Amino acid sequence: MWLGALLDTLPTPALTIDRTTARRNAERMRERCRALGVRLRPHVKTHKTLEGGLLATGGTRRGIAVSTLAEARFFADGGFDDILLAYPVPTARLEECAGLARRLDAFHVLLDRPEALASLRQRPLGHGKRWLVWLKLDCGRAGVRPTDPAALELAQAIANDAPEEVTLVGVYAHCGNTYGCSGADTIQAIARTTTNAVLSFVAALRQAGVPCPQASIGSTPSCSHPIPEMSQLTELHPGNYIFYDLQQTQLGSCQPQDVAIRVLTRVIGHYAHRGQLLVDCGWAALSLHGAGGPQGCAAIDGHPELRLVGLTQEHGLLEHQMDFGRFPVGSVLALIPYHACATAAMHPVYYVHEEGKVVALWHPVRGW
Amino acid sequence: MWLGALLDTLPTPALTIDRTTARRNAERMRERCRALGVRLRPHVKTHKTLEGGLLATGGTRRGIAVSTLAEARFFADGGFDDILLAYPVPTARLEECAGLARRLDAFHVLLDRPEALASLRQRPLGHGKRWLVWLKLDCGRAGVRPTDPAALELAQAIANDAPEEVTLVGVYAHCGNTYGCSGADTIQAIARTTTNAVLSFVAALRQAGVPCPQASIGSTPSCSHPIPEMSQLTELHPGNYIFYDLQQTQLGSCQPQDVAIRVLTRVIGHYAHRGQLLVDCGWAALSLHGAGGPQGCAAIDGHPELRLVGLTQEHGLLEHQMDFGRFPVGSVLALIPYHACATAAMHPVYYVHEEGKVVALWHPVRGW
Numbered sequence: 001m002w003l004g005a006l007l008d009t010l011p012t013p014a015l016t017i018d019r020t021t022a023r024r025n026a027e028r029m030r031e032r033c034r035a036l037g038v039r040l041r042p043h044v045k046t047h048k049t050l051e052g053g054l055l056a057t058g059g060t061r062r063g064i065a066v067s068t069l070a071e072a073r074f075f076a077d078g079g080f081d082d083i084l085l086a087y088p089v090p091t092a093r094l095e096e097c098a099g100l101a102r103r104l105d106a107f108h109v110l111l112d113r114p115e116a117l118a119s120l121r122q123r124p125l126g127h128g129k130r131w132l133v134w135l136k137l138d139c140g141r142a143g144v145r146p147t148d149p150a151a152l153e154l155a156q157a158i159a160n161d162a163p164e165e166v167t168l169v170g171v172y173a174h175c176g177n178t179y180g181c182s183g184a185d186t187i188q189a190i191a192r193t194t195t196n197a198v199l200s201f202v203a204a205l206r207q208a209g210v211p212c213p214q215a216s217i218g219s220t221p222s223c224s225h226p227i228p229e230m231s232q233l234t235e236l237h238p239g240n241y242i243f244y245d246l247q248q249t250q251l252g253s254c255q256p257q258d259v260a261i262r263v264l265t266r267v268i269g270h271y272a273h274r275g276q277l278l279v280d281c282g283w284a285a286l287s288l289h290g291a292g293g294p295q296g297c298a299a300i301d302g303h304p305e306l307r308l309v310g311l312t313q314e315h316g317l318l319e320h321q322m323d324f325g326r327f328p329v330g331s332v333l334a335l336i337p338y339h340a341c342a343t344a345a346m347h348p349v350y351y352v353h354e355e356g357k358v359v360a361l362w363h364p365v366r367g368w
Numbered sequence: 369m370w371l372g373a374l375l376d377t378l379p380t381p382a383l384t385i386d387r388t389t390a391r392r393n394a395e396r397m398r399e400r401c402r403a404l405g406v407r408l409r410p411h412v413k414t415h416k417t418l419e420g421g422l423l424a425t426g427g428t429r430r431g432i433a434v435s436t437l438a439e440a441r442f443f444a445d446g447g448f449d450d451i452l453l454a455y456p457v458p459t460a461r462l463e464e465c466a467g468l469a470r471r472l473d474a475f476h477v478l479l480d481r482p483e484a485l486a487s488l489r490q491r492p493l494g495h496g497k498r499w500l501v502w503l504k505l506d507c508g509r510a511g512v513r514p515t516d517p518a519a520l521e522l523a524q525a526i527a528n529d530a531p532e533e534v535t536l537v538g539v540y541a542h543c544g545n546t547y548g549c550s551g552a553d554t555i556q557a558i559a560r561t562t563t564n565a566v567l568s569f570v571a572a573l574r575q576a577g578v579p580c581p582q583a584s585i586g587s588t589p590s591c592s593h594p595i596p597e598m599s600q601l602t603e604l605h606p607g608n609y610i611f612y613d614l615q616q617t618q619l620g621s622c623q624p625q626d627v628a629i630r631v632l633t634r635v636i637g638h639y640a641h642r643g644q645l646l647v648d649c650g651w652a653a654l655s656l657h658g659a660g661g662p663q664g665c666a667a668i669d670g671h672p673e674l675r676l677v678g679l680t681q682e683h684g685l686l687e688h689q690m691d692f693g694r695f696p697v698g699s700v701l702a703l704i705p706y707h708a709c710a711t712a713a714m715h716p717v718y719y720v721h722e723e724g725k726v727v728a729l730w731h732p733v734r735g736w
Contacts, residue, residue, distance in 0.1 A: 011437075011461060011736055045681060067682050069379075087682065088636055090648065092698055093379060113637055115697065141683060142637065142646060176680075268456055269481055269510065278510060280458065284713055285736070291660040312544075313413060313709060314435050314455065315509060329483065330460055341681060345652055345714070348735045367716045368379055368653070 002351065005358045007264065008332040013285035014264045015347040016334070017243065017362070019354050021260035025242050026055040029223060036231040041065055041084060041216070043239025046341040048364035049350070050078040056242055065237050069096050072107070074365035076100060084108035084134070086172070086237070088142055091119040101125050101132070110172050112136040112143040114154055117166070124165045131165065133158050134172040134216065139197040141176065146201040152208065155201075159210045170214025170234065171205075173198055178221035183252050191222035195229045220244075224253035243340040246299055247290065262301060262334040263343060264351075265316065270324040276309070277318035277327055281335060283311045287346055290338030301334040308335075370719065373726045375632065376700040381653035382632045383715040384702070385611065385730070387722050389628035393610050394423040397591060404599040409433055409452060409584070411607025414709040416732035417718070418446040424610055433605050437464050440475070442733035444468060452476035452502070454540070454605070456510055459487040469493050469500070478540050480504040480511040482522055485534070492533045499533065501526050502540040502584065507565040509544065514569040520576065523569075527578045538582025538602065539573075541566055546589035551620050559590035563597045588612075592621035611708040614667055615658065630669060630702040631711060632719075633684065638692040644677070645686035645695055649703060651679045655714055658706030669702040676703075 002009075007016065026042075033040040042056035045067040053064055053075060061079050065086040066072045072085055073096075081104050089097065089109040101107040102125065111117060111133060120131050135155050136143035144151035159168035175194040178187045194217055205212045218236035230236065240248065244259040265281035283297075288311070290296040300306045300318070310317035318333075327333075337343035344350070344364065352360040370377075375384065394410075401408040410424035413435040421432055421443060429447050433454040434440045440453055441464075449472050457465065457477040469475040470493065479485060479501060488499050503523050504511035512519035527536035543562040546555045562585055573580045586604035598604065608616065612627040633649035651665075656679070658664040668674045668686070678685035686701075695701075705711035712718070712732065720728040 013736060088646070090634075090636065092634060092636075113697075140642070141678070141680065141685070142639075145641075148641075266458075266460060268458065268460075271510075273513075273516075274508070278456070283710070288656045288660065288710075292656065292662075293660060310509070312509065317509070329481075342651070342656075368381060 002358045002361065007351075007353060007356050007358070010264060010351055010358070012264045012266045012332065013281040014351055015285075015343065015349070016262045016264055016351045016353060018260040019352050019359055021258065022055055022242055022352075025244065025258065025260060026058070029238065029241055030058055032223065032226055033236060036226055036236075038231065038233055039063065039235040041235050041237045042242065043067070043086065043237055044071060044075065046240040046243050047344055047350075047362070048074070048366065049362040050075070051352070051360065051362045052242065053078070053080060065239070068368055069093060070365055070367045072100055076103060082106040084110070084237075086110060086174070088112060088136065089116055089120070091116060094119065094123045098123060098125055101129055102127060106132060108132045108134060108169060110134045110136045111158075112138070112154075114157065117154070117157055120166055121162060130167045132169050133166055134169050134214070137171050137173045137198060137201060139173050139175070139194045143173070146197045151201070152204060155205055155212065156208070156210050159212065168210070168212055170212055170216055171198060171201060173217045174237075175217060175219045175222050178219050178251075184225050187221045187251070187253070188225060188227050191227050192229060194222070195227065195233065199229070199232055220248060221251055221253045224248075240340055243344070245340040245343075246336050246338045259336060261337060261340050261343065263298070263337055264332050264334055267327050267329050267331050267333065269329060270327075272324065275319060275322040277306070277322070277324075279316040279318060279333065280314065281316045282314040284313050285346055286311065286316075286335070286337060287339065287342040289342040296338060298335040298337045301336050303333065370726045370729065375719075375721060375724050375726070378632060378719055378726070380632045380634045380700065381649040382719055383653075383711065383717070384630045384632055384719045384721060386628040387720050387727055389626065390423055390610055390720075393612065393626065393628060394426070397606065397609055398426055400591065400594055401604060404594055404604075406599065406601055407431065407603040409603050409605045410610065411435070411454065411605055412439060412443065414608040414611050415712055415718075415730070416442070416734065417730040418443070419720070419728065419730045420610065421446070421448060433607070436736055437461060438733055438735045440468055444471060450474040452478070452605075454478060454542070456480060456504065457484055457488070459484060462487065462491045466491060466493055469497055470495060474500060476500045476502060476537060478502045478504045479526075480506070480522075482525065485522070485525055488534055489530060498535045500537050501534055502537050502582070505539050505541045505566060505569060507541050507543070507562045511541070514565045519569070520572060523573055523580065524576070524578050527580065536578070536580055538580055538584055539566060539569060541585045542605075543585060543587045543590050546587050546619075552593050555589045555619070555621070556593060556595050559595050560597060562590070563595065563601065567597070567600055588616060589619055589621045592616075608708055611712070613708040613711075614704050614706045627704060629705060629708050629711065631666070631705055632700050632702055635695050635697050635699050635701065637697060638695075640692065643687060643690040645674070645690070645692075647684040647686060647701065648682065649684045650682040652681050653714055654679065654684075654703070654705060655707065655710040657710040664706060666703040666705045669704050671701065674701075
């Protein structure tokens with residue numbers, strides 16, 4: 001157990017989180033939402049921890065989005081409620097989903113397929129509880145396209161065809177395309193295509209008589225630079241912004257000072273004959289995100305001089321012509337990982353710190 | 369709990385292991401070693417489970433190699449002994465290492481740096497126990513090159529400079545370069561460069577008077593097609609062969625029938641407007657190994673027709689012009705992952721089966 005310990009005292013490789021940075025990230029996104037006049041429903045998948053959920057949620061333990069039934073149950077058991085399973089409701093695990101809707105005052109599910117609604121129907125919840133259903137709009141991975149006449153009919157059906165077993169809480173979209181383009185202006189344009197498509201859809205819905213109280217979008221990039229139009233929605237659901245990473249920095253969503261996550265690693269040997277540092281962080285600790293080369297999986301914090309040139313399971317190789325006196329064996333470098341969500345998924349524990357001292361240990365759930 | 373359950377009954381995504389295939393893989397490598405006249409010291413990092421260790425080890429719980437101190441302790445607590453930490457002994461965790469050498473009759477460590485030997489010296493074990501040290505030869509990631517005069521002096525020092533605190537058990541090499549070349553003949557040539565360099569080194573050692581009882585090499589590819597020269601060594605230490613994977617199949621180390629591992633996934637929706645299957649297996653369940661594109665992370669077992677065209681954290685997209693009637697929502701496809709070690713590291717549980725029925729659950733250790 002490590003409360004109090006100095007950072008460069010931990011066993012490496014080690015996922016570290018700056019709690020100052022994390023808190024500041026959480027509170028910032030909360031304020032952006034207050035300013036817009038919308039609810040924040042953070043997504044917990046970047047961290048999958050109760051503590052994380054607490055920060056994002058501002059201390060309330062209400063209003064989150066999860067990516068799996070394992071997260072759903074984990075947070076449910078930790079006392080969270082108003083939990084949205086942001087994922088095409090899994091018709092093969094409805095007993096579990098129904099279990100959760102029965103325990104919780106508000107467990108939400110998403111669908112984008114009529115047969116999904118059918119499945120829900122033949123598994124009524126009872127107890128005067130209704131499937132709280134959101135319609136996923138693909139404005140292009142999953143969901144119905146808002147211009148497809150079929151989207152309209154499905155929304156219709158969810159909302160009205162069986163008002164005592166199923167209800168339409170709102171429409172749900174994730175502008176995850178912001179992940180394939182560079183700089184604020186493109187990010188914002190995707191934010192705009194997405195906001196207006198959703199607003200058009202809700203407009204059509206009102207015109208046709210389909211009640212639809214809520215309207216949800218957001219990714220870390222588009223909620224890092226919200227556009228005025230977003231205030232006409234009811235809620236934003238980013239998640240990763242609580243940690244950020246190199247990718248987000250390269251995207252422009254955030255300045256380096258915003259990135260709360262590192263993976264600490266040790267120089268465990270020099271190789272002059274190849275001009276390389278050897279570090280005790282391989283891909284088991286980092287993931288191969290940012291290669292598709294290895295140079296892009298992470299940067300060395302405060303050392304633009306060095307880059308990653310190789311990763312094995314438990315080893316990494318670093319290059320400069322080098323300077324092995326500057327990096328004695330036993331020294332700790334702090335790696336900035338490319339994709340927070342991915343690195344985090346490799347760690348059974350996060351060392352959370354303030355002022356260089358470990359202040360807490362968060363343990364993520366995992367699995368399905 | 370799932371003992372007995374039919375495969376297509378599990379919650380997906382799910383790592384599955386054919387125990388018939390696994391056993392057969394273990395016993396085969398055991399026989400190759402018997403035939404060669406050498407000891408098998410399997411590496412456990414592809415699976416990191418006690419059950420796995422049991423198979424590889426033939427039921428004995430003795431003679432393994434681990435990639436971390438977490439594995440070392442996990443196996444030590446499960447009753448394994450004669451455990452080699454195949455990794456530049458971590459001078460920053462010597463209290464732990466010393467802890468393990470004291471509990472175990474044989475805990476082995478590797479080094480390739482004089483200062484490492486120095487570190488070992490100022491942390492004597494006591495109790496008439498000696499650091500059991502192997503010399504890592506880089507015949508090109510870590511270790512001393514056998515032609516570097518310095519290799520000779522270091523071996524010398526390990527063996528003789530302090531015979532009551534430190535001993536040289538043998539020389540250790542991993543021909544992990546077989547991972548960058550294609551087909552039996554290149555694999556075998558690397559096997560040969562490596563075997564002879566080691567044999568030359570041991571020859572030099574004998575000539576100079578440096579006792580060196582053991583001599584260890586091996587990777588899954590080179591021990592899948594052992595070369596006669598290998599019989600002059602004392603031990604082989606592959607690991608992955610117990611599961612195999614697409615990579616190994618693409619390399620030629622094994623036929624598809626040899627690959628014990630799958631990740632089961634469900635078709636959770638169709639998208640005609642894009643000719644794509646949606647599956648509940650993203651990278652959280654698979655890893656991004658085999659991209660550096662996504663088509664190469666895995667193949668669909670019995671369906672050369674389909675390929676992976678996208679992975680998100682919890683989603684995968686499949687393509688053919690398609691045929692959505694052949695793949696009803698709820699059907700299970702069995703993905704063949706590229707790199708067993710990497711996929712396995714994403715699963716807190718392996719569903720182990722015979723004749724389509726879950727016969728066991730293995731739980732891997734993880735962390736550092």
